[PDB]
């Protein structure tokens, strides 16, 4: 009927498939449904607020930068030129790592190079 390789392939396929592995549908009572809706809506609102806060902050930073660069242009042309360069190949430093869940054994390195 089937080889051992064929069997193993079928098993692998099954791992991915939804055939006889999935539970019943999540039914709720009307009160429960409402509670869920209120949870979700509030959360969504909170997320929107956070986005606006961050977005606003970014806008403020941009405005400050603009204000700075105009001033620099007014005062010292050479300094302005130096500031406003193409940073095409700018690379973030490899020490600035993505913050983990829990910290390492040695928290901070005081010596380098």
């Amino acid at each position: 009927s089937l080889s051992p390789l064929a069997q193993r392939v079928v098993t692998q396929l099954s791992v991915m498939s939804a055939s006889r592995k999935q539970p019943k549908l999540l039914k709720l009572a009307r009160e429960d449904l409402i509670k869920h809706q209120t949870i979700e809506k509030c959360w969504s609102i909170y997320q929107q607020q956070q986005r606006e806060r961050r977005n606003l902050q970014l806008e403020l930073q941009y405005k400050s930068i603009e204000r700075s660069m105009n001033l620099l242009q007014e005062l010292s042309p050479r300094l302005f030129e130096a500031a406003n360069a193409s940073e095409k190949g700018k690379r973030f430093p490899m020490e600035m790592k993505v913050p983990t869940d829990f910290p390492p054994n040695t928290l901070w390195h005081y010596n380098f190079r």
Binding site: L5, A6, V9, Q12, L13, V15, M16, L25, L26, L28, L33, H36, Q37, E40, W43, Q47, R54, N55, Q57, L58, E59, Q61, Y62, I65, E66, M69, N70, Q73, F80, A83, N84, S86, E87, K88, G89, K90, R91, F92, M94, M96, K97, V98, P99, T100, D101
Partner: protein, 274 residues
Amino acid sequence: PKSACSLVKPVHHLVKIDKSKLSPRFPELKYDKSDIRSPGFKPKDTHADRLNDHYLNTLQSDLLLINYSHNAAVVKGLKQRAWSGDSPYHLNRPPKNPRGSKAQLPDIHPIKWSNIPGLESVVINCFVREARENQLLAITAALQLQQITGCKPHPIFSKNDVPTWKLRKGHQMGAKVELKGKEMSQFLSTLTEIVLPRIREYKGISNQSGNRFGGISFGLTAEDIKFFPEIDANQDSWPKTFGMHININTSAQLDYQARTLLSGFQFPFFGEEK
């Protein structure tokens, strides 16, 4: 059929009739997939995404600061040129195609608080070419992909036909999976930390790699996939591992911006940039 003449009749009102809602056929389908009452419901925001949080906190501001060019105006792309009306044959003529390209190119905007570059989507294209002989290899590749991602893969089929390579048309051959949001972020984090350091002579992603507009890519060999912890868990069940292409899609206007963004997430870049 009395005729094939298609011709949508005009209306006498501005109300937008959603035809789906007027039926009683698919009552479960009227609910949004986000809604709890839909069978399509899935808990989306299950836990705090770490890479995304990092981007929000540290990187995004830094990226904005980098990308500020003073009084930078919009750079319009190559577009379809109109004809000068110096002849009456120009009068209903289609526009001249773009200068260098056949297809139109997008406008490059200055980076401000709104349009800072960020990760948009990851796609993991795995086309196993031995599966022209063995269909079961495609299945195994799809499983591997699923294991790696925690996301449902989609089967790739042979779209073309060719004699030199023993390839038919309409044959299942490997799989793909578009990661988005938190799963994608996790996958990137795993790539940065676990997998890519275990690749021996790994210099990084090439600086000559990428789209013209905010898309960067690279690929992993069958040797490299055995470093993923899910495959590592049961390497026995992964003898014939399959390589894969990894298309990272950013919200970057240009490719150097995208590269910079990826560097922020601890991706090394080695080659000479364009």
